[PDB]
């Protein structure tokens, strides 16, 4: 697991085993949310590597065990390119309190989604920027409910739609308000609140509606976008439409509506004791027919590890028709061809360690600091290291050798190879540094002079 850097110290990235990689892969590069199940001794935070799992970008921002990161992707604010991910504290019952940060592609933040007035925070298991430059943000809070005519504590869901520049909530969305407490599949826990939906996905559907995904009642359900009626029910107690044999899923995540016409879910199909020996998670593709209130699989993709994720997951529809699926809480993530061939299987070296999701998008970084570098001397001469965190355009190095930080010169140009790039050169040197090249050679940054040591 992760080694120490020479250039960035303060940077411990967990590292990621490739055990396969064909050619085919989509273009881009992996968002993951790394954690030691919560605290771990492990640095935690939003991270983006490549193909090879080398790392790209680290950010480390967990707080120990009381606030830690998580839901990491890219999205699209204003027409520009962000990035999104949660932070907050945990509860009992496996949802959060906290935030969404939003930040640029200079990675400096430029917002901050939080839950509307009198609600504590909101949830960490989805958000999503819509292209209206609103927020769907989802809260979690405590609330008494009288079940069987008994006074029960519940874990309601508020879903909200925000405008992000002024905060102010424009839709509000209760699930005790439309959806009842037996619908849930859920054991009944006698001190801890209800959990009865648990909703964890939140989508816009082709005609604007939503499409929330609820983990304890084994359903998804589509809302309206104004008056907030349900329009129909998929799955669970109170299904809409004809089921097949595998196309019914549970304990499921990750809904939305993909370009081909098809619902996409990831079917854990399981929980922790609280499945048939054999079940394995599946990613699901399914062809519902609102006419005939029908639902079929269109295909479906499995772990070649024969993965049972009891917790979190994703998928995703490449543009090329590729499928990547994240395994959440095993710590792997795989993407097929349309065919369900594996062209990429990965996992953390770490057991231990795992990933809310695991997705692709392409990224152009564009960080505002300088190149980090180092030089230590020895028989040979010196050995330069190089490191630009977030840096993505970076195709090689240039090193630079001189006696004062006025006088370097060009010695050697290498290919950057990894997020620390080493080489060596015959001389000796008081002062390095490097220069970032693209793959035209030229020139990104410049690091400071660094004395040889
Ligand atoms: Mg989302
Ligand atoms: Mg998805």
């Not at 939003?46 to 799992?53: A, R, S, T």
């Not at 407490?181 to 559907?205: A, F, G, K, R």
């Not at 095993?330 to 809310?356: C, I, Q, R, W």
């Not at 993505?392 to 620390?420: C, H, M, N, Y």
Request: net charge negative.
């Amino acid at each position: 697991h992760p080694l120490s850097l020479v250039t960035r110290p303060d940077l411990l990235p967990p590292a990621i085993d490739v055990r396969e990689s064909a050619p085919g892969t989509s273009p881009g590069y992996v968002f993951l949310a790394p954690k030691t199940g919560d605290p771990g001794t492990l640095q935690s935070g939003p991270m983006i590597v490549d193909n090879e799992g080398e790392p790209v970008w680290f950010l480390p921002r967990g707080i120990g065990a009381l606030n830690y990161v998580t839901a990491f992707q890219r999205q699209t604010y204003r027409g520009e390119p962000v990035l999104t991910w949660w932070e907050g504290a945990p509860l009992p019952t496996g949802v959060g309190v906290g935030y969404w940060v939003v930040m640029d592609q200079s990675y400096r933040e430029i917002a901050r989604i939080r839950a509307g007035k009198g609600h504590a925070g909101a949830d960490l298991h989805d958000m999503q920027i819509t292209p209206d430059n609103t927020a769907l943000v989802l809260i979690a809070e405590p609330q008494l409910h009288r079940v069987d005519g008994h006074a029960r504590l519940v874990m309601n869901n508020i879903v909200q739609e925000i405008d992000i520049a002024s905060g102010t909530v424009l839709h509000e969305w209760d699930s005790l308000r439309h959806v009842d407490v037996d619908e849930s599949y859920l054991s009944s826990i006698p001190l801890l609140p209800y959990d009865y939906v648990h909703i964890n996905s939140m989508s816009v559907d082709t005609d604007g509606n939503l499409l929330l995904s609820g983990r304890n009642t084994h359903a998804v359900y589509k809302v309206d976008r104004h008056s907030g009626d349900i329009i129909w029910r998929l799955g669970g107690k109170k299904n809409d439409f004809t089921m097949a044999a595998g196309a019914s899923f549970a304990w499921q995540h990750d809904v939305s509506r993909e370009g081909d016409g098809t619902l996409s879910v990831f079917d854990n199909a399981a929980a922790g004791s609280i499945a048939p020996p054999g079940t394995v998670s599946r990613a699901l593709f399914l062809s519902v027919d609102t006419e005939a209130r029908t639902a079929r699989v269109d295909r479906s993709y499995t772990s070649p590890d024969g993965l049972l994720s009891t917790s979190q997951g994703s998928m995703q529809l490449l543009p090329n028709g590729n499928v990547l699926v994240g395994w959440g809480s095993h710590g792997y993530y795989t993407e097929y061809a349309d065919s369900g061939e594996v062209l990429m299987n990965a996992s953390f070296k770490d057991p231990l360690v795992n990933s809310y999701r695991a997705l692709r998008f392409p990224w152009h970084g564009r960080p505002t600091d300088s190149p980090a570098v180092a030089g230590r001397a020895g028989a040979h001469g010196m050995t330069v290291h190089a490191s630009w965190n977030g840096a993505t355009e970076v195709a090689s190095w240039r090193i630079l050798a001189g006696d004062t930080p006025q006088s370097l010169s060009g010695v050697k140009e290498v290919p950057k190879d990894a997020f620390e790039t080493s080489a060596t050169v015959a001389h000796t040197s008081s002062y390095v540094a490097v220069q970032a090249l693209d793959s035209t050679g030229r020139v990104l940054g410049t690091s400071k002079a660094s004395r040889v040591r």
